[PDB]
């Protein structure tokens, strides 16, 4: 129900000690007037709120997936 | 016969006053130390309509002499009183419209309204719109004051009784005809259940002393003595004279 546009605060949420699950959603959407691109959403399940980070660049998306904490339950699709 | 209409009103079941929308009882301040020795200043906050009353009302705020707060008083507004005006009440108040003074501290011919019959009853006389009391004499030795009432009667009142300088606002109301039954209906909708009225000669003998007969007529003199009992006092009670 809440959206974050900063990567630095996103990583802080993943180690908030109350976060246990997360999901990755891949969307195939069309841009303004170009070829289709893949859009990914990172959703962090907090105690009170769900935080969604959306990034449209697949190059930076791959790095963020790897950098996720190994102790966090991550659901792919 | 059965109980007649005017007898049934004393039970007060459907004949009580409709007081939901009333602003409150209109009274002067309680006679206190400041009133009887000096004066106290109040401020008019607003002038508002009161349901069932022709004359408008004024909300005046005074300070409490004995503790830190404000006190609200509901007065009957005189002509010329406006919002934001200072009101002075007491023995040493000035002779200005809206001020409350004892009847013994004003000159001859002064026009007053909301006059106390006795000191401290907080206003009994000259309350309807456009009415006033004329002060016509003083009796300093007997501490009395002679006044003229709206009905024309002359009354002797204590000089310590209070009154408000001026005439009750809203005058001239009764000069405009109601012009139809609908406006009469709404007038008494906010007063009491006394309208419309059925004539007694239109009823049956069981209902009214004027009822019955093969013609619609009274049949006996409509002047009824003061000594008659309930159920008989219908018509002109203790009339000294009749006719135009």
């Amino acid at each position: 129900a809440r959206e974050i546009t900063d990567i630095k605060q996103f990583l802080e949420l993943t180690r908030r000690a109350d976060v246990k699950t997360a999901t990755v959603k891949i969307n195939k959407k069309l841009n303004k007037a170009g070829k289709p691109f893949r859009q990914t959403k990172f959703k962090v399940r907090g105690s009170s709120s769900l935080y969604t980070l959306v990034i449209n660049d697949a190059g930076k998306a791959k790095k963020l997936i790897q950098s996720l904490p190994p102790t966090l339950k991550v659901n792919r699709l | 016969g059965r109980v007649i209409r005017n007898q049934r009103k004393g039970a007060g079941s459907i004949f009580t006053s409709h007081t939901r929308l009333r602003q409150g009882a209109a009274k002067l301040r309680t006679l206190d130390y400041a009133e009887r020795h000096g004066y106290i200043r109040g401020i008019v906050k607003q002038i508002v309509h009161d349901s069932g009353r022709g004359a408008p009302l004024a909300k005046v705020v005074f300070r409490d002499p004995y503790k830190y707060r404000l006190r609200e008083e509901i007065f009957i507004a005189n002509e010329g009183v406006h919002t934001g005006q200072f009101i002075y009440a007491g023995k040493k108040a000035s002779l200005n419209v809206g001020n409350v003074l004892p009847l013994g501290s004003v000159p001859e011919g002064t026009i007053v309204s909301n006059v106390e019959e006795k000191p401290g009853d907080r206003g009994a006389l000259a309350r309807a719109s456009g009415n006033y009391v004329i002060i016509i004499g003083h009796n300093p030795d007997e501490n009395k004051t002679r006044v003229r009432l709206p009905s024309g009667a002359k009354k002797v009142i204590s000089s310590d009784a209070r009154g408000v300088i001026g005439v009750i606002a809203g005058g001239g109301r009764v000069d405009k005809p109601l012009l139809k039954a609908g406006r009469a209906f709404h007038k008494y909708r906010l007063k009491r259940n006394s309208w419309p009225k059925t004539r007694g000669v239109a009823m049956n003998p069981v209902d009214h002393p004027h009822g019955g007969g093969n013609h619609q007529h009274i049949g006996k003199a409509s002047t009824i003595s003061r000594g008659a009992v309930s159920g008989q006092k219908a018509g002109l009670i203790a009339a000294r004279r009749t006719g135009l």
Partner: protein, 91 residues
């Protein structure tokens, strides 16, 4: 263009209630719906609320007055009487 000859504002009553009664209402209806000068701000912005209540559109001030006019003839006389008697007790 003139729409009525003599009824004026009482044309809303049609032919009812009698000409004499309609004439009496016409005189008082014009007064109560009229616009009056304000003695506090000098503008022509005083109209009636309920009977006896007169409020100025500007300067947000309300004055108690007559049922259908701001000031009655009787109240004007009272002001003169109070003024005359006031000057006889202070000077």
């Amino acid at each position: 263009a003139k729409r009525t000859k003599k009824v004026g504002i009482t044309g809303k009553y049609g032919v009812r209630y009698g000409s004499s009664l309609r004439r009496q209402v016409k005189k008082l209806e014009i007064q109560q719906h009229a616009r009056y000068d304000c003695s506090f701000c000098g503008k022509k912005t005083v109209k009636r609320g309920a009977a006896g209540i007169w409020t100025c559109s500007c300067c947000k001030k309300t004055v108690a007055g007559g049922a259908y006019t701001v000031s009655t003839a009787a109240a004007a006389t009272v002001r003169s009487t109070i003024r005359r008697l006031r000057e006889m007790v202070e000077a």
